[PDB]
Design a protein around this nucleic acid. Structure first.
Ligand SMILES: [Cl-]
Ligand SMILES: [Cl-]
Ligand code: NA
Lengths: 67, 67
DNA sequence: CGTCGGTGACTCACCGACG
DNA sequence: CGTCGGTGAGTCACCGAC
């Protein structure tokens, strides 16, 4: 048939668009998950940097009041 | 008669597909929200650390101005 | 002002879990 | 052994873009 071919290729083009939709959503989820993991490592390292600095600051303040 | 046992399975799968699609979108929203707050939180921590780095330095200088 | 692709939702195929 | 639910994938109906 000839209408059966217009319907067949339409089903093919749409099958690919569905796969593109699903793949884009998966790549988006991967991207976000990779980003949160990285931002959580940065936050942890900053919280650790801040903790050492607060310690160093208080040691120096007490060294300074000892004349 | 046997068409009812098949309507009931399509319903059960209809419910499972819905629950499945929903969880996917919920995960994306959580991550997008988490990225947003982690970017904000890290900018606040990053400046906290810069300020501490300067306070420690000024303190190291004040210790040497007293031998 | 007519096709195009994108997308929500139903459905089926397939798989591992498991009573 | 056989049914279950989760999930990938094909399909339909519909819509906005252009
Ligand atoms: Cl199911
Ligand atoms: Cl088309
Ligand atoms: Na639904």
């Amino acid at each position: 048939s000839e209408e059966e071919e217009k319907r067949r290729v339409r089903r093919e083009r749409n099958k690919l668009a569905a796969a593109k939709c699903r793949n884009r959503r998966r790549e988006l989820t991967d991207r976000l998950q990779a980003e949160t993991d990285q931002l959580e490592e940065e936050k942890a390292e900053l919280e650790s940097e801040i903790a050492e600095l607060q310690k160093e600051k208080e040691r120096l303040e007490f060294v300074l009041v000892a004349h | 008669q046997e068409r009812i046992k098949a309507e009931r399975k399509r319903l059960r799968n209809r419910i499972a597909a819905s629950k499945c699609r929903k969880r996917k979108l919920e995960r994306i929203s959580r991550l997008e929200e988490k990225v947003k707050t982690l970017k904000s939180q890290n900018t606040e921590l990053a400046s906290t650390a810069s300020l501490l780095r300067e306070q420690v330095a000024q303190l190291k200088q004040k210790v040497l101005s007293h031998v």
